[model samples]
Structure formats: C-alpha cells, structure tokens
Target chain A: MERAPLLELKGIRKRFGELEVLRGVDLALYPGEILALLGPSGCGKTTLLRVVAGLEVPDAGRVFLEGRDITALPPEKRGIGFVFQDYALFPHLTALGNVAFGLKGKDRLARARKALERVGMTLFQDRRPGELSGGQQQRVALARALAPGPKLVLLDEPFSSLDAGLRAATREEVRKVLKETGTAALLVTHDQEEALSFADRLGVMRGGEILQVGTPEEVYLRPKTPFVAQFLGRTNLLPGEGRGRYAETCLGRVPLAEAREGPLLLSLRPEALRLTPPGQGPQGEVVAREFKGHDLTYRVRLHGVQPEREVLVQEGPTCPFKVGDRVGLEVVGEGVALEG
Target chain B: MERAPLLELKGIRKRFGELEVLRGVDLALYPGEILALLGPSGCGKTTLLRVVAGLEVPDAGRVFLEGRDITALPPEKRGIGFVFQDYALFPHLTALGNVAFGLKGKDRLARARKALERVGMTLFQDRRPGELSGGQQQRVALARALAPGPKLVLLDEPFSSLDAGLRAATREEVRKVLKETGTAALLVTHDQEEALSFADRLGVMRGGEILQVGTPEEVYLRPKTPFVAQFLGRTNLLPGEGRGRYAETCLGRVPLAEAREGPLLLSLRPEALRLTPPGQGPQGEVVAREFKGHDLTYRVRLHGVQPEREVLVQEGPTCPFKVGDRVGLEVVGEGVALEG
Candidate 1:
C-alpha cells in the first residue's frame, strides 16, 4: 500500500454525445505493479485506457507518470507500451523485424534480440507473422513493445485474440515476462477470471464510476458494494435479522462481518453455505448440481418454511450429496452484511 | 446412443487451396438433443457447420435430415436455422420485423409473436436493433431463427460477443428455451465451459477430424489424448511404468483402468490428487495456490524427485495447504493411463 507511485490518473472525465462516459476517475499504479480495470460492457474501461494513452483526450483531468503531467503528450513521446487485442504485428515483417521496427539508436537490432530473448521468442525470430500461431504472434508483439524500453505498459485484452485453449498458458508466460522485467502494467478487461488471477490490484467500475479499487482478495472477499460482489462472482443475498456481528436467517444464526439490527441483507459466498448430515433442524434436499472439473455447484431446495427457496452450494469434486438427499443446511461463517 | 438421429453427416470432406480443412467428418444429432463441436482455433469446426447448412459445398459427403439426403439443398430450402457469433440482426428492422422478415403467408405476424414469446423477447419486439444490448439482440436473433420452426438449429459461437458477466445467464436462458421447444441443436465452439454445460454430447476435434465424442464427463475425465486432457482442464501428466491398466509412478503404484506394460503416461485431474496431513510417504511443499470462489488450486513441489516435478491439486475453499506447508499427497483412484 505504501509503494511509490508510477502512473496515476487524477479526476479524469469524458463525454460522448449525450452520454457521460467518465464522471471523475482517480487511479494509482505502483512501480512494477500490474493493475486491472474490470467492469461490464459499456462501463468505460476501454475509454479510460485510451485516455491514458493519449489516443482520446479527456474533457478534464490530468495523467501522470512518475509524478510528471503527461496528459498533453503524444502516445509515443510518453514512452508507453501498447499491447492491443489483435496483437497488431505487421504481416509483412518477420518476428525479429517486427520487434526491431520502431526501435531507436544504432543498437536497435541488439535491443530487439534482447527483448525477444526476454519473452522466450528468440528461437522463432526468423518466422514471419503469417507463419506464427496466435500465441506466437502475441509473444512477438510483446517483444516489440519491450524493445522500446517504455516506462510503462498498457495492455487491453491482449490474450483475447488467442483461442481459449491457448489463453491460460499464454497469459502465464506473458505475466512471467512482465514480472521478470519489472514492468508496471495497466490492463483493461471485463473477464472476472482474468482480472482475479492476473492483476495485483483490481479497479471495479460501473456506469462510468470507479466504485472500488483493491487487491483481488480484498475485492472478492469484502466487496464495498453489491455490484462489486455480484460482478466478481456468484453471491447469495438473503434477508436476515442481524445484531452483534451475527445474523439469524431462515436457516439459523450465522456470523456477520459487522453488527446490525432489524432487517438487513446478508451476502454469502456459496462456499459459506454448508450441507451437513441430516439433523433436528432446517433441512434441504439436493435438487441439481453442475460438475465443472475443478468444482461442483449444487442446488438445494430448502424446506421447513412457509415458502420453500432454493440455495446454491459450491464444493470441490467428490461431493457426498446427491439428488434427493436430505441434509441439514448451516452457515459456517458470518457473511458480509449490509443495511438496506 | 440409440435415440433416432434428427440429422447426420457422412464422410464429409473439404479442402481450400493446398490445405485440407475437413477430412471425412461424420456426425449425428439425435431428436431434441444438443450436440456441441469442441476444438481449438483453425480446427475446421465452423466449416463443418457451414457444409451441413449448405452454405459451403463439401468435396465429398452426404447430409441427411430425418433420413433424407439434402447434400445439394440450399440453406433456406433445408429448413435449418442458423445463429451466428455476431447476432446478425438487420439494423433497419425492429425485433418483430426481423422475426417476420422470412415468414410466408398472412399469419407471419402471429408466428413472429409466438417465436418472440418463446425466446422471452416479447417486451423488446418493437425495439429497433440499435436500441437493444448485446444479450437482448441475441435473443431477438434467436427468435428470428426460430420463427420458421426449422427442423434443426446451428449455433456458431453464439455467445462469444457477450460480456463475461452476461454470458452465463444468457447461455442458461438460451438452453432453457431450446429445451422447452424440443429443438435439435448443433453448437460449434472453442470454449470448454460452454460446451461442457450447454451440450448433451461433446465432439472433440482436431486437424479437421473428430477424435472423440461422448458425454461431458466421459470426454473430460477420460480424454483419449494428451491434447484433449490439457484442453479441457488443468491436468498433471506424469511419466509412469505400467502393466495392464496399472501405472507405477514416484508417488506409488496406483490402480489403472486398463492393463499395459512398459513406458506409459498418466493424466490425473487435479481433484484426483489428495493432500493428507504430513506423514512418512512422499511429501511435498505447497508452492502456490489460487483462490477461486468455488474452489482452490494449489501447486505442490514434490520432494525426493529428480528435475523437481510439480503437481496441481484442486480442492474446495478452506483448503488446509498453504505456501511452504509440507503435506503428503497420494493418487486416490486409477487415473486415465495411456501407453506410448
């Protein structure tokens, strides 16, 4: 939290026709940090990136890199790397030529070779863009960006152009390269999985407002707003009678993060909902479940109430519950509680 | 496996320039079943779909619908609906107008209304294409495709345009509508999660050939090749000595599904790796872990092994293993083994 600042956006605002795309956005990036802006479609995340790159001028506010106001500077003059969704490699150029294209000084070839080596693409240096696969082309593109030795890197959905089968491995490789080089990166994406695993810090935005910014664990575990909670993953919101850091719902008493009274709203991660062996308490029957190789999601039809409700429970594979199994449902921890 | 097929393709083959895009591809779609073609990029999945729809001419093969040959039939005459990645709704038309555009007779309006209702797009019937979001427009597109009551529906990466936040909900709604209408659908996609959850049968393809076809569980857990194993999910492949279906690895001798001798390979799902409390048998130190809301993936560095091999283990949240924690690991079942 105390790391020295690298890139910062201060009070950025913009408009498009009748739409106010960015009201007032403030962000900070630390040296050697990877920050991701996450939101739904039409949430102005891409617009914010363009504004930072000087491709689109904001109506107001300043962009700072290493404490310098670079808002009016051209993209090239700012010395920032841009990795686009399409890789953007020149089709006519060989891998080595692409990396050496915009490099300056008499040692351009040497710099390009070093960059290619850094990204582990030196072996494919002779191949043309046409001969390279999507993942390979992305490596060449990344090397090109690094050949210039920019102060910061800006990536906008860079891995998206690759096939889903290739994204995971390519992302890991790219992240490793970025870290090994100590490059501060700012990425823009709407994919939660990408945001969670790839970023050191996450900025959650919606309707043009940056609602919250924190580490992935911070945002996922203690989302400041409901939008952040549901945007990051599935959450069950239930009515509860809460007090003294605890809540009583239809299921039973559960722990809460904060103390409250009267009617309240409780948000529980599916993992917090536990299905125990049948006991003398509220019971539920497993109705359906989805087997995702890594985990399983079960739907429980809760009984013992005037109106039965269904709850979703997620567990690792090898779950003991099955369809029509009666089990006592309980809350393991006090989930995040909010006053409505 | 015995349900009558609503559509079938026999010995389908195609070539472009010097490249053979598809080679003797055979497939079938049972009545009221959803079959998805899963593959990597440039696997010729979309080309196969185009051939079935009569949009592309196959060099050799026969297409059948309800046991009738339709190899030469034009797309419209074949009475098959198509949903594309782009939605492809007419920009000049309203939702209702788009659905009614291809209908015949004076009852076009009534039939269009019914189709819109089926897709849960009635409220947006009068909305212009420009006025709808990506998901809403996709619904209208689905309705337009269904208005003619086509015998078969072909979806080519239909949900790729959707944001990650909206994709799951939209996919569920689309699947529900298809089920309620008893429509036979063939989906082509490169997304593993989509194919696993949305299709009744999955066809794994590569190099323009279908290598395996079966239920999601069978294909995921018992992949016949290394490519399929890694493509579907994270798997730890280890070198082992085998006899019959049993394989012996550094961890210990484990059961095997088939009997084989000599050099062999094992594909173990992360869930199959169990981490018991520290004990005498093979021990490992946790190197890293990812905290997904539904599950956790931990990387364990096995001790007393040459080359320092690492294995990934998937477990439910509240995992006991932490970075640098020593733990004992063992394979619980006879994992899928392949003789090389």
Candidate 2:
C-alpha cells in the first residue's frame, strides 16, 4: 500500500494589499520523494518555499507536514529544513556551529559532525563562512539544513550560485544525503535542465499556478500545452493551415498531423528538422550556426513565408552545411501533437 | 601593423600588504580584438582590467595603448568605456538618457539612439532601469558604453545577472556588435566557455599576472601550465613512472609520449576518453551520471587509481550504462602535451 503524502498544501493563497501572488495552489508530496518546482521569475517559487518554511503567511491556506498543520508555526518550530540560494550560513558561526544551530538539546555537536561527515564536509567544520570557498559554504549550508533530520527539505535555488563544476558535485552530494536520509525535498529553480535532472517528479509552475506535474520524461516528451513545449526547450512553432492530409506551410505540404482544419502551429524539435535540396520543400537560407562543444545549432531561414518564421536544426559536429548554405527543409516524424 | 598593439603590459606587479595580487604579468592585445580576461573570483582578472583602465595602478609595471604610455593616466582620460559587473544604470535616467550621460556634446540623443540601435536595444530607449528586463538593462549599459566609440570597452561580468536563456541570447548579440562595429572589448568573467566563445583572444589571469594569452583552441589544446588545463576544464592527469610507450592506466597501455622518465603528470581531455567492453581495456565503475538534456556526463571510478581520479565521459543518450555498471575505457588522443 502507498503511504499518504508527507506534505500537502491545501488551497494556498498569498496576497499583499492590491497584489495577489499565489492564487489557490494545491500540491502533495509523498515521503522520500522529490518535487521540483520549475518556473520563471515572479512565478512564486521562492514565495511558496518561504510559506512552506513558515517564513511567510498565506492569505488562505494551510501547510502540513506528516499530516500535521504548521501554517501558523514559526520557521524554527515548523521542523522543515531549508537550503537557501545564497549559502545562508550564519557569518559569525563556525561551519560546525552553523550545522548544529538547528538541533535542540542533546549532543548536537556529535550529531552535527555526523551530518557534515555524511556530506564529506567535516574537515572544514571549524571554518567560518568567510573562511570557506563559495562551494564549501554551499555544502555547509546543506549540511546544516539537514543536521536535524527534518522530514521535509525546502531548497530554494541551492546550486544556482555554484560554479558549473561545483554545482554538479554539490548536487551529487546533496542527492546522496536526500537519498540516505529519505527526506521529501522541494527544490525550486528557474533552470529547466536542473529541474529535469534532479527531480523525481517535475512540477512546472507558471504564473501563480502549477501547469503540469509528472516525471521529467512525461512532461518533456508529452507537453500538454504550447507554452510548456517551448519553456522546456527550443521548439519551432510553425504557423500552418491544417488540411485533411497535411498541414500546409510555406515550407510546402509537409507530413504534419491535421487533427482539425484551421490555422495550426506545428511544433518541431531542432532534432526533427533536416536539410534536403533547394526547390524540394521549403526554400530556406542558412542563417547562422552555433557551435556547441559536440553538437551544432543552425538557424535556417525560410523565404516566401512569414518574415519571423525560421527553422532551427540541431545536428552532430559532422554537419556538411555551414552558415550561408541554402537547403530544403524536411520533417521526418509523424505530425507532432498540437494545441491552440 | 595590427594597430601598433593597442594595449601592452610588461612586468606588471601589484601587491597588498601580505599577498601578491599580481606578479610580473606580460601581455599584449591588438586594436580591434576583444580579449576576455578570465579566471576565478580572486585570480586578479579584474585587477588587470582595472590596471589597464587606470582605475588601479600597478606597483611596478608599464601600460601602453597604441604605443603611448597610460600607466599614470586617470581613469576618465583613458578614452575607454567601462561597464561594472552590476549594470549600474542610473535609476533617474531612461535608457537613452543613461546611454547619453557620458556624451558631453550637442545631439547626444541622436548618437545615443544610434548606439542603442547598434545593440538592437532601441525599443527599450524610453524605459527606465526598473522597467527594463535584466538583459535589456545590460544592453542599455553596453549601448551606453559604446556610444562614444571608445578605442576599448572594459566590462566586468556583464551577464552574471541574466538568466541562462537571456545570457545566451545577450552573449550572441554582444558578440555581433563587437564584430560589426570593430570595437575592441576586454571583458572579465570567471566562465571559461564565456571567455572562449566571446573573445578573439583570451588572457587567463592569475595572481595579478597574465599566465597565458592565446586563442581559445590554442589554450585548450596546449595549456602552458597544469593550472590552466584544470581551470579551463578538469584535465585528466595520469602518473607515469619509468618511461614507457604507453601510460599503464587501468585502461591498459594508453599511447602516451614518454619523452621524460619518472614522476610525470599528463593532461587529457574528457571528451578524448571513450568507452568499450570489459576485455577491451581497463574498466571503471560508473560512480555517477549527469543527464545534461542534450548530452550525458558519466563519471567513472576507475579501479586502482592514485591521486583520486574519475573519468568524465560525454556520451549520447542511446548508450545504455547504469551507475553500478563497469565499462572499459580508452584514451582517444595520444595524450595531451605536458605543462609546467
């Protein structure tokens, strides 16, 4: 049998005089699971985290931990760990002291040592926040947050301040701790890849509402809306008129799914785009090529079409065509799923 | 030739009471070339930029622009445009007014408009700093810096505030203006890729010294020091005692140059490592895997390795390898050239 949700938000609403921030949002998370909140800025990701941590008051909702209401509780009494974006360690406290600050009564030192040991940060326990490197301070923050073994961990942009290399390392260590301690973690970030890579269940939040909630693969592969499709990654929103057989684009009649007969926007992944020959399909020009370490992103321009319309191609480093080379466009997959 | 080397610094030295910030730096940059001064936070990249900009004077050194000495010149008289890490746009001024603030002549608005248009930020001219997006504010800053067409532009970590999406877009736009206007820009950033992708030349600054100045490929393929190799990207360093045809790595005999005998440290690119079957070569357990959307990064813990080493493999999504799986590894290159 499945266990009940360890944390639940019952119709959460937050407002400030004339401004409404979070509007009647609901969510639930099971024990030992991850819920990543992915969204743009001003989407209330941090606000939601603050509310769950009891750092903010909601207009109309209750926050529960292990089925216990903690909406009006003080931040410390809420018994929820928070790993903040800016390394949030007390400047005056040593790393060890900072890690033990959350524990109430009984051998907090030994317990803090154990927590730092788990994170491989015990060696630097004597150092203050000023003495530590940015990455070290970040680890100390995580260690301190988890020292008391809170059932739910709220991480607000934890790895965002870290260097790319250290970010990868820190996330690995944090993931290990969350796994070993079996803490239900709520990670909030604006980075899509970070959300996709770290989360067990991805929750994409837009504005004040959660748009979709599922596994990363489910949300990425089968985006229910056009906004979700583009937000996750690059997509070509091809404006077309859907006929019975195909969607007619300036690129000519391509094998796109015509679910209904009207103007449609065909979603095309960069990988789905291909180049043939001129006068074959869409008459396009090679606009520019972006050279990633291993792959290449080519912006292909199409004429006899909308001025804003352009196709993008993601190819391996072995692309035969460079910028300024004209080529025909081809869509190799079955017509992509669409929306209005 | 080459516009008489716009800036030249020889034996540049700067020191605080205890620590030596810069030591005997020697560098040269051409007129119309963007040289990115890149390194870690305290690596002195910013100090070098300031020294050239006349904001900071070296204890003992020489600074020249177009063969004229400028070491003692005031910051304002250097005929250089400076942009702080923060956009530093005046809150009281609109984008246009901010861009034209330094232009102390008639028709400043016309010049500012053209400069803003040059950066494709004319649409945001009427907006205040608070009204504009982070990227737009930066564009405004850049446009302001470039309005008077200074011989050089010095930017300190301009895109650090931008979101990843906005950063990428703004980087391309900034590069376009630099290339189109023939304006030489010197930017200070800790991001290796940002420096590599944007600069015509890169000066890896360290300890207030220019350690290496070369094209991105030159520095990557042939780093003059072990620090450079590791800083740009974690280079594989293998121990080689008793000169042999190949380094006796767990991957078996790697084809490495054995010019010198015992106590050798060699750097190799991560992408240069390939995976094979068990019998093919030395094997390593997959310690971790990072799914980077388009690519996968596998960190393999090789058996019987000294100095704590993990091989990073950049692979396609199709390769089926799990965390606990052991896989054979092989070096793709002969071996990277040794550095001091």
Candidate 3:
C-alpha cells in the first residue's frame, strides 16, 4: 500500500579526487513526505543531497523525479529548490525582491508575495537580508526557494546558523509551511534532535552509505548497526548470550526485540533502563551523575562485570540515586540486537 | 558556611562605541568552583570573561583576585589561563611544545609534560595540532592552559569547535582535569545543556546584566525571571492570579513555589505536565507532537483558555495521545511565579 516515490535515486556513486564521497547510494522520497538524511560530517549525506538537487553529478546510476529520469538535468531545470545553511539571500535586495528573483514572468512578484505569506514572512518583506534576524532571513530564504513552486525542496543544514531556541521555532514554522503546501522535502543534517523532530522518516548514513532508513522511532530504538545506535543517542552495548527471546548479561536476563541464538551485543538506550533501590535487582554503584533539567543520567558500574563496565541509566529529575549509591537496574523495554 | 571568593568583580561596566557590552556586572567565584556564564550572543558573557582575564579594561569596576585589586593588571601577570573556541594551538608546534609555550623558567618543559599527563594527552604529546583530531587538539589546548598552574581558567565556548559527540566527551574530560588540578574555571557558553551539565553553579546573563546566579538546580527549577526560565528550557507561561502558595489559571488551581499576592505569570516546564485521558482533568486537544528519541513533546490547546492558547507537555516515548486527541493535563510539580 505504498505510493510511488516522487523522487528516486538508484545506485548513485560520486567521487572527489581520490576520495569516494558517495558509494552506490539508493533512496526514495514519496510525495508529501519529509525525509531526513542524518550522519556525521564527511559521511556523504551532503553529497547525496547535492546529487538529488542536480548540484552534483554522480559517476553512476540515475535520478528520477515522478518516474522521469533527471540524471543529466541542470539544477535550475530540475524543478527542485535548495535551501543552504547560510540562507544565501542577497544582502542588497529586500526580502520580496530576493524571493521574486527566483520567479519568472509578469506575475512573479504576486507569486513571491504569496510565498512570503505562506511562510509567515509577509511582515518582513520590505526589509533587506542584513536587517532581519537570522530566523527571519532563513524564512525569507525558504520563501525564495518556494516561490518557484518546485516539486521538492532540499535543505542542507538550513537551521545550523540560527540559535537553539530560534532553530526549533523556525523548523516548526518551516515544517508547517511545507505541510500546508503539500511539498516533499529531503533534509540533510548531522544534528540528531533536529533530524528526529523534523523528518517523517530518517536515513542513517555512515561511510558514504545509508546503514538504515526508517521512522525516527524505528531508527532510534531498533538501529541495525552499532554506529547507528551510538550516533543517534547514548546506549549501553552489553555483551550478551542470546537464547530464544532473552539475552543473559551482567544485568541478568534481558528481553530481546526478536529471538536469536548466539553471542551478540545489545543496544540498550539509557532511557530504557530504570534505577531501583538496592536489593531489588542486579546491583550497580552510581559512578557519576549528570542532572539535566528534565532528566538525570547516572553512570552505573555493575558489580558483576569484570574490569568494570559502566551503563548509563536516565531517570526523571527527582531520581534519588547519587554518586556512590548502590542502585538496582531494571530494563523497561526489549533490547535491540545489532546486525554483524 | 561559605568560603571567601577566589575572584570577584564589582560594578564591572564596559562599553564599545554605542553598545554597552557589560553593564555593572558583579560576581564572585569560590575556589575550585566551576561557574558557567550562560547567555545569548551579544549579551556580554564573552566580554565579561575577557575582562576577568585582564584582556579588556572596564569603564567602571574593580577586579579582585584573592583580595588583591587586579583591574589594571596585564593578562600575563593575572595568572589566569584562557581557552578560546578555536584551540589556538600553533599548527607547527607539537602538543608538548604548545603546552610549554606558556610556561617560563628552567623547568617549563617538565611542567608541560606533567600537564599533558594530567589531561591524559601523554600519548599524543608528539602530535602537531593539525595532525590531531578535533577532540585531541582540544585536549592539547586544555593541557596547555593547565600547564602554567593558574589559579583560575577562563574558557570562552571552548567546546564549540568540536562535533556534538566529541564536545560532550571532551568537556567531560576537561572538567575532570580541572577538578583534579583544583583549578577554578569560568566557562562562557550559550548552550543551556553545556552550562547545566558542566557547571557547579550558573550565571544567567542578558542585556549586559547578570539576571541570576545559583546552582544549576536552583536556577533551573526556580528561575527568578521569565527570561531565565525560557532561556534554560522550554516553559509554558500561564496567566495566573497568585495567593499564598497557590495560583489559579486556565489550568485551574496550581501549586506555586512560593507565596504571592497579585496577578503574575507562572513558568511551568513542559516536563512538569502529565497527560491523562479526557474527563480526568482540564481537557485539551493535542495539536502537534514531536517525537524525540527519549521523550515526546505535545502541543496541547486547552478548551478552558479563551482566544485559544497552547501549552507544551512532555512525556515518555510511549505516549498514547496523538494529534486531535482529547487529553487531560495534570501538573506534576509546583510552577515558579516570575519576578517583575
């Protein structure tokens, strides 16, 4: 029951000098879907995005937009909009003027004004890029990209320049605008929180290849590899022996998401573990505690593990366990086993 | 019992052209204490840090170190180590050589080697700055800063250059080094999480003024102003009438952290609100939901609020509510009534 993808990439490969930037990359974006390509810097997420937007040419494979081959299309003729990290609006031009510059024909100004309104930037239309705030400039940039009504938009770390508070708000506004316009989007970013919240689905990339692509929950909770598990968030990679649906480790028997038989590693998120009072379960001493406003993460050293292994357990701010306190660890959810 | 301050600033004021960067700022840092000056850009956090390092002359104020006035002292004579956002390590110099550059006298090389060992950089002492990874370079920078045996160190967004994962690990290591050496440190950063997790105490800055200074828990749980509340984390500002230890607002009667007599705004953190099934409490419609791996933040519009009002509620990942779902909002803890 899946609709045909609005855009597709088949075995795309790219290289820069001696470095292979993208190696046989494949992805698909459905109409009106928001997909985030998340990875560390130099992982080729940006190169993939550039290829999709026609800013870069692949050494092999094809790009399709709505079932049409667009492998050799120029960026401007590809019907794809691009929003860069720096906003890239002309400083000398007013917001409306910058937006209208991307449009064509006599009704371009009217369309640009409409686009500005759509992004909630109509009030700042008369101001130059330099005069507006970072968020405002980003909104204007979005409007400019959107004025031409592309089939899809490609955002490369668009919220990177803005501060934390403004970044969240602006991304929310941008998402609303995109949803209202029923536009597909492919966002490339290295920030996990930004990618998790902004995208309908997430593609975890590493070493010039996408390791896994799934909904945020799936990618985060059931990461296919150790890199994906650690990249997305803090997790305890426990050495375990799996049998049936349970894994036996230093913390005793833990439920696995799926049945398996062999020695493997389990990716247990900090938030998936709860700290109980001593004597309730396998005991561990709190080695360190970091109190974030909403949650407290305790680095616990299990008494049963040789050479000392610490597992991080996150609880609400009111967690009673302090450093040196002996606490019991309880697994709340099934652990994810990584693929070899 | 409180110890005498190792460093103090009284009525520190600095202005450049038309901008007043630091306006009558007064602060005290106890010995071996880690204090983070948290604020937005252009709020004078960096300026204050510079003034403390004797790099800037205040228009009016006194800087006291160990009970001696040092307002006119040169940077070198102040005996304060400074670390910038950029590692500032010489590309040509090895890690050991870079650390020895700040030290003087016959035993400088031995002292630098000891500092390198203290920061766990003994293995990388022969590596040049350019040859090292960002985290390794940051460690080298820390070793250099700690080599001179300064009583206090000032770090101005020193971790900003590293990627997210490296930043956290590096900061933790830096903190460990600072603590082991018993070196008092003043870190200036706009990142709320960094400030909260790294500092023993925090100073909230805004508009060239220090709004509040307290332990991270004190400032975060009971912020003195609306700005402090919102700056540290997401909060819902509810219009409420306060009396005694209670406040009445659109969410009905709420427990206040302290007694108040008049109309005011309550800063309720998103995590402090629990969502229950409808008919149990005041009803609200979930308008938006953001699925962060560890938690979920829901934007709920309450039926009791006139002219429509939305409040953000955060819950665990297993939240059952979705957009358009009618839910009950339950306040978990007391809300802070902000100062005028």
Interface CA RMSD of each prediction in angstroms = 2.2, 3.2, 2.2
Runs in model 1 with CA error above 4 Å? A90-94, A123-131, A259-262, A306-308, B1-28, B39-78, B82-102, B106-110, B113-141, B160-170, B205-212, B243-246, B257-263, B276-279, B285-287, B320-327
lDDT of 2 at A50: 88
Q: State the lDDT of candidate 2 residue by residue for A7-88, as single tens digits.
A: 8999899886747788878888888888899887788888899889899999998988878899988986888889888877
| Model 3 lDDT per residue over A57-93, tens place | 8999899998999999998789999999898889889
The TM-score obtained by chain A of candidate 3 when compared with the true chain A? 0.91
- Model 2 preserves the real interface contacts to a fraction of 0.16
Rate residue B309 of model 1 by lDDT.
91
Residue range A1-340, candidate 1, lDDT tens digits: 5476888899999999958899889999988889999887788988988899889999998999989999999987888888887888898888999999979898988889999988877788888999998878888988998788776899988887677766767777888888988898999987788878888899998988998899888888887677787888988887888877788887778788877777877778888887789988778989997877766788888887648788888765667888889988877755787434
Sort by lDDT, top down from the best: 3, 1, 2
TM-score of chain B of 2: 0.87
Better of 1 and 2 by TM-score: 1
TM-score of each: 0.86, 0.81, 0.90
lDDT of 3 at B305: 46
Q: Which ten residues in a row have the lowest lDDT in candidate 3 chain B?
A: B160-169
lDDT of 1 by residue, B296-335 (tens): 7888999878788999887766676677889898778557
What is the DockQ score, from 0 to 1, of model 3? 0.50
Best by DockQ: 3
